[PDB]
Symmetry: C3
Subunit: 210 residues, 3 copies
């Protein structure tokens, strides 16, 4: 298309598409639970990447800046599902799952608001609050066979989720240090790893079984 970042968006679409199908066929045939959640994640990401590529999930924000809003719609559902996998994995109580999913909702809802805000400076305010929520989620993940995989995914989550605020911050969504074309690439590479990459470790693992 007429947009440089189309190929990354096309790439995200295919890669997320391929993973859903792969996860879909592997799942035939707790494990069920883990397959259910883990397949939904790239499946949802797949529709939002397609929406971004076709231009539906793109809007213009004055502060006129092109903002792909559709990833927040993605992240609103797929990140709590990712937390649930982890939660599942270690039999998290309902208190902690609730806490996590709530902070997650706050993390993404405020990121969206930051994304769509029309006063430049206020954007970072929302960035920080959202970061605070991320840091709480990461904190819960750390302080409160299976315990081996969990440590893996937890490390993966930490390294991958901590990259998003940075990319948004320096990217076209934030201070505009790095152009849209490049922050779209970074998000795609994070997203494929955080979801497809995350999925294979979990799903290729016997930790998911009773």
């Amino acid at each position: 298309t007429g947009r440089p970042e189309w190929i990354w968006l096309a790439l995200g679409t295919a890669l997320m598409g391929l993973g859903t199908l792969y996860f879909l066929v592997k799942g035939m045939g707790d494990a069920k639970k883990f397959y259910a959640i883990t397949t939904l994640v790239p499946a949802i990401a797949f529709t939002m990447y397609l929406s971004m590529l076709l231009g539906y999930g793109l809007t213009m924000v004055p502060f006129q800046n092109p903002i792909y809003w559709a990833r927040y719609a993605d992240w609103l559902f797929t990140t709590p599902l990712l937390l649930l996998d982890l939660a599942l994995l270690v039999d998290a109580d309902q208190g902690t799952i609730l806490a996590l999913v709530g902070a997650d909702g706050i993390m993404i809802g405020t990121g969206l608001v930051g994304a769509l805000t029309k006063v430049y400076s206020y954007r970072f305010v929302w960035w920080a609050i959202s970061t605070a929520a991320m840091l709480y989620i990461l904190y819960v993940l750390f302080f409160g066979e299976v315990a081996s995989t969990f440590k893996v995914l937890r490390n993966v989550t930490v390294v991958l989720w901590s990259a998003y605020p940075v990319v948004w911050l320096i990217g076209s969504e934030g201070a505009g240090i790095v152009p849209l074309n490049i922050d779209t690439l970074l998000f795609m590479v994070l997203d494929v790893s955080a979801k497809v990459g995350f999925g294979l470790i979990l799903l290729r693992s016997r930790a998911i079984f009773g």
Copy 2:
């Protein structure tokens, strides 16, 4: 009102209104669970039909085409609740419920996107993806007293849910073969049967009891 399809919208409102109340009084007095879910469904449909009739749930989409977006808001909640009844009925695991509700969310979210897309051809793309999700839900319903009712509702679901993609496809939302006035009528007749019609079979049945 100045719109031909007002009477179908008025009709949906009343019929969905009447059912909520009927379900509401019958429910006094697992069964509770089945009454809770089953009454919410026309209750929600009732507010969205009212919203369409008063014109709040109507918008214009260039590709300028009048689109009733409010039914997606309806379907986003009422179709997963319908799946839950079924799930309930056969003690579905949490894996399968999750799978179903996720594909359902994808089914409606993509339908909405198709509904609001401004490139004609892309609309059908979203139609197909949404159809794919429907076909997966229908597949789960089939392959994985009470077992008698369930077969009934399952047949009902299959016959009624399979009609929606067709009406959207040939209707004013899709190729525009059939005018808005008529696709509004078809959706109303499907909606009343899928919810009120569905509700009576389930609720007049002893399968709902322990």
Copy 3:
């Protein structure tokens, strides 16, 4: 800011901010569950109050009337969480929780629609329907150590939730008897009490423990 009601919005922000933190530190360290839900509530309210104050959660509605839509986004999540605390407290079945949360969703969704409607008279129609849903929730709360606290919070809920329809009705959202500046103050005072005020009674109580 240039808006009279900024100070109430600033006040809501701080007070809701302070409560989240307070609840956050107290929670370290069923109880977990009660802390999880109860801290999320002002935490969410905190972001929406901030959004209103910075102007993101404010819009203009013709019928041109300034409408703070962001509180519905707040109430959509925080009021069902408040109901859940109560539900928790008395071991409500899943049927009743579902019923309550569904009517709650209807209560707020219709209030929002009323809030955004462009035909003056229709607004009250949506007001009434939303009120009907409130009255059903209040009805469930009444007709179907711990039983002592519960009665307290239930009384509190009843007195505080019943005030919202009145303020909306006479306020700038409704008939415009009382100016925006004043209905913003009333909502803030209700919100802080319904959430922070509600939280302390519950959280300072041993009813939350096994």
